[PDB]
Design a protein around this ligand. Structure first.
Ligand code: BR
Lengths: 395, 395
């Protein structure tokens, strides 16, 4: 048998990870003959371990399609990254005749698929494990970009643009500096998106604090001051993972704001987007949405073609911007991240270069708005009907 | 001939105040014979004092029309509240034959507008003063609602909803509480918007901390705990003006978050919208945008009708929802705040009642998206041609 499929989400969720789920599920449903029942892990991989499976077959076609415009993880997710655990996974998949494992997550998920695939054969129950890319941090290697990043980038760009229009109108006699804290503990891709608020036809002062750059309060204040002098105001985009001469600097926005007041005496305003930036399906990138769905669909097609231990990718064929689906071996993804290029950050280290803009800009192109009802996005909530347990409990 | 008009934006800006500006300008242009030239003060009333006027007559029709989908104050705003200042305004208005004064702002602006009349009348200078309503706080009396609020409410409801979908999917083994800090120092209308994220078809735990309700940590933690037990997670919307016993409570989000980890040991996440909530034209309320424009158009119609010391209002005539333009006396608006009614808040003081929902829901109805270019809203920046000075300086 081994014709059933298992899909699970891992790590932090995004605004379009459900689009990837729809790609996987709709592609799998069109199969049948190859793929039997489609199960999902409640709350992720942990659902697999505790045998809390969801029968996605009980969701209507309309409900699955609605996943394409619904934020976060419709089946739940977790940050659970063990011989006993791996063996338990195989036992559960075996009990439910699962021969396919579609794991939708970041870098760590890639390694899991690799281990699941290799241990399954060793235990006499081979499973095709396919990694479906996801990460708002945009740190996966090989692929041109990661599903979820384009939408966060669009949100950050739009938000930075709007906050800049606001502070600008008030800068004459009131607030002159706005500080926005964004995600990106180690990578600066998110922060970089803030630079998109500025254009050649409409230049806007956007001082970016990247995690990759060592924070220099002196250079920073100097930059802000020069901006306030030239434009009358200044917007600051700061990553949560910025570190100074030491390490780390609880918000990072309140702290940066105080430095500006303390060293320049300028009135300020600050905000922390936190979860809003990664769940902003109301202003998602159409390009990102299409790519997220594509990756899910391709995972299934690759599995049916007989591939194993691979990850579909986004290949930038041309810059108009054109992309196609590619395929990477997980041995090339396991570990090794996509660090932000040094030539993507300006000489002063507070902005993005034209090279960076050329890369980022196409990723936020287009708007894909969810339908509305009574003033709000009509987001879907799946029935997520539980699957009867077959094994004894797991701790 | 005292036929020119003066328009100025005052106080904190909103996402649709430019919609009101457009209503005034396009309405004023169809006049002529009654109104000569339409000048705007650069940076509000300050512009009138330093004789830094803008001739909107030199703005293209396309740009004025674009104001309808552009956030913040396109002419710049300010927070400016002796006989010398009045004598200066009169000199400036006289020098430019200004007989109409349109002041677009909130409660404080209403008072300024009142003083520009009651005093200019006894001073013998024919000038009609008309207040154009604006305030994201929704605290102006008489009018059913204020231009700017509907859009902030839509933004808060959408954000709370998206943040709730996010926390819910991670709640199993991770973050269980999300705290969002919103605006509103004395009125809880903003915070109330958070309650629209939930409904009968899809109940969502949203504990709202209003400025009108005295904070009781014990009652709060109890409410949260009960939510986490029933749903598995909880969302908290807290106004920046919430006060406990000694009135108070680096912002309120981190503070409230701490109380949850302390008294309940629940993993949390928090954000602070700040400017984002009042410049979010990318997700403004269509109803709000139409009312904002209607108020600007009505102000001009009133001026041409010979009215003085008045403010156009929105009158709810039915609920489906139907409204019309009304006329209120500034003397009844000046220094009066429309706080949240006691019956709009639930018994435990942590939610909104059905009466509140009946009032709020219609205000966030409809989506009015601005046009986009290169992934971002194509917001307009007016040319704002200066008017050559005719008088001596003023400090
Ligand atoms: Br009158």
């Amino acid at each position: 048998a081994a014709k059933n499929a298992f899909y699970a989400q891992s790590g932090g969720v995004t605004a379009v990870i459900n689009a990837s789920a729809a790609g996987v599920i709709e592609a799998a449903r069109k199969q049948s003959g190859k793929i039997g029942r489609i199960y999902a892990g409640r709350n992720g991989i942990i659902g697999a371990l505790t045998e809390d499976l969801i029968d996605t077959g009980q969701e209507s076609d309309a409900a699955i399609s609605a996943l394409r415009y619904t934020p976060s993880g419709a089946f739940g997710s977790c940050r659970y990254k063990n011989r006993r655990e791996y063996e338990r996974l195989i036992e559960v998949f075996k009990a439910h005749d699962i021969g396919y494992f579609f794991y939708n997550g970041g870098g760590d998920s890639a390694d899991t698929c690799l281990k699941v695939s290799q241990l399954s054969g060793t235990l006499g129950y081979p499973i095709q494990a396919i990694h479906v890319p996801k990460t708002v941090d945009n740190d996966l290697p090989i692929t041109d970009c990661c599903p979820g990043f384009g939408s966060v980038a669009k949100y950050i760009a739009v938000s930075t643009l709007e906050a800049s229009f606001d502070v600008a109108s008030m800068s004459a006699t009131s607030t002159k500096v706005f500080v926005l804290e964004v995600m990106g503990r180690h990578a600066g891709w998110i922060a970089a998106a803030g630079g998109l608020a500025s254009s050649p036809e409409r230049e806007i002062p956007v001082v970016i604090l990247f995690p990759e750059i060592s924070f220099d309060k002196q250079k920073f204040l100097a930059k802000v001051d020069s901006c306030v002098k030239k434009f009358g105001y200044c917007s600051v985009v700061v990553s949560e993972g910025v570190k100074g001469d030491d390490g780390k600097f609880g918000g990072v926005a309140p702290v940066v704001a105080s430095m500006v007041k303390e060293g320049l005496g300028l009135k300020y305003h600050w905000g922390v987007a936190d979860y809003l930036q990664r769940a902003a399906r109301h202003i998602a990138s159409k390009t990102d949405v299409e790519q997220a769905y594509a990756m899910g669909q391709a995972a299934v097609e690759f599995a049916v073609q007989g591939h194993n231990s691979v990850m579909p990718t986004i290949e930038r064929i041309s810059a108009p911007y054109q992309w196609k689906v590619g395929m990477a071996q997980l041995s090339q993804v396991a570990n090794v991240e996509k660090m932000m290029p040094e030539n993507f950050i300006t000489e002063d280290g507070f902005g993005i270069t034209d090279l960076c803009r050329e890369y980022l800009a196409p990723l936020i192109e287009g708007e894909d708005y969810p339908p509305y009802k009574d003033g709000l996005p009509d987001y879907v909530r799946l029935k997520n009907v539980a699957v009867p347990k077959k094994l004894s409990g797991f701790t």
